[model samples]
Target: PEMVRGQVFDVGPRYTNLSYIGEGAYGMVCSAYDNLNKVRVAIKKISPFEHQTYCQRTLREIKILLRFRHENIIGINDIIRAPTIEQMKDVYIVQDLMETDLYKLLKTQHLSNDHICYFLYQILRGLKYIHSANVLHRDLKPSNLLLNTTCDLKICDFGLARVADPDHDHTGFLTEYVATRWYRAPEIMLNSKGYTKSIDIWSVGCILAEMLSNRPIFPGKHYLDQLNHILGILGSPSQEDLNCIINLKARNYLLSLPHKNKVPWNRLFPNADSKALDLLDKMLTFNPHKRIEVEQALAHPYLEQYYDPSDEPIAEAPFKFDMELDDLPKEKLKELIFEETARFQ
Candidate 1:
């Protein structure tokens, strides 16, 4: 079945691998060029066993992307099934390439006050749509976010996405403990539990704080360490807060959880406005049940009054990239992730 391919799609000419972007718990992503279209896009090349957890995750992500179509969400132009160079039983999925991510941007400079405000609004808008569609993005982090050539943010990496039947009282599937350590919601970190959209809100809050401070608020390497770091700032969750949070399937491990703490956002963002800091506090609340909902977050004074999107460049038309078209790899990019892990230790 032939669908669409850059007018004329081929491996070597249409899409060429320029540079390696990253490798995750599953696979690696490379900067790919679509020569035919002369545009830049991210090529998330994943290798999965014939039947495993990875396969299910990949299939679910594809479905999730297919179902949701928002400018704020990353676009999947087309699906490609290509052969592995040296293996007869291997295939690859060549997706639209993304130039940079928020994580990468965090390395170079602090986000302009305007950029921070605009990006957070876009994120909330995207979440509003996701929640309205009765779905949840369990994994939301800066690295999982991609930027178009225009530099506008788009949510990507939906491997952890799951459809929510809000009509049902109890959760249907028993969600496993997932999400990057630091961006993980407190409930997920503490109970080894299945949670809800609250997970995404907590992550967004962390991202907002990071954008303002230009550093991760909670970069814990382990669950307990991350828990303590959050506890230190947000205090501990009360029993009422914890009761609604821990699922029946995940209740066996709820240990002596701490109570909520109060850390002034002004202390976290010394120069930020009181309104902006106030938004951060509520979203980063210790109780997932009490975390800021997307609707309320979108209406927050920090966003409604303070955010200015005029600073963001308009989203340009979609196109592929040709690294050779610009210049070959300039220099070997270094991984400076050591400092991040060191904080957790």
Candidate 2:
């Protein structure tokens, strides 16, 4: 049978839609069978050319996704586009399909300690790989984490992710805001200087806590309230902690707040094990520099029994794209995307 490769029918030839899955701001998602590959996959459709911001995000996601090859990271199998340039209005991303995400799973039932441990471990494993590639997964939350009936978790949604320079060059960077408000790191909340991969670690802590408690640890209504919520739990940052905050306004604001004491971990997580609590304490620390790295978190006794030699972090050649793409015009972006799309063919 000849495989269909374009948007010539209701469903593309390469894939046959089984059902409509969901929709987001960008596009619609559907579960489909990959007729060519003979497997099930999820297809996401978006009109990247519709907006400049959307175009850039779509290009960034495709560039980063193509470089990833990990068990705990969502794999991009193939991309489909309109066969003709004039008809190129939408692009489809083909990805491995999961039955549900962590958010949905947690909503249905409580996860056991073993389930928490393995799920968190896999997330750290994925972060280890992503960070090693010098890419920051700025948005990490239950909704972005995909899970299967087997309890496997893979991190997805890299649209907000950025490629930091090896030398830590963040100059001319745009968009200070990233990550969901609840899972956002203190450094990000404060607009601190030179934040690193540790920001992602903070998110990992929030997620692990949610897995144990079945609720968001910091459910703040707004950024200011979000910081206050975090302060209520973690308490006021110390002078040492405040020193790490490079933003003077953020520092003075913290100093002006009413003095508070740190909340007891056992009280916050009544059912969590000692090892789990210990790891959470390290990860949820106020200072980004003090927050545990993915590699260190993976080595903690909390995940010790589940760790395998293969799970150990490995430094890989980092991923990058034309820096020009950062400020590329819409027309140039369209041209670049068209050429990149053809390369996969």
- Against the reference, the lDDT scores of all candidates come to 0.64, 0.79
At residue 225, give the lDDT of candidate 2. Answer: 74
lDDT of 2 by residue, 152-230 (tens): 8889988878775425423221225768889987666565323368778889999988999999999998866778888
Q: What value of lDDT does candidate 1 attain over all alpha carbons?
A: 0.64
**Candidate number achieving the greatest lDDT relative to the actual structure:** 2
Count of residue pairs whose backbone atoms collide, per candidate:
16, 0
Q: Candidate 1's residue-wise lDDT over 1-345, tens digit each? A: 111221222335556645666666656555667786787666655555343456556655665666567778886664454332223222235556666889888988777777888889888877777766656787888887877667677888777766553333244223436678888876665443434677788889999999898888988876567767877777655567657654644343334553455677887788776777888888988766677888889878888753344432222322122112112121110011111112212
Steric clash pairs (candidate 2):
none
Candidate number of the best TM-score:
2
TM-score of each: 0.73, 0.91
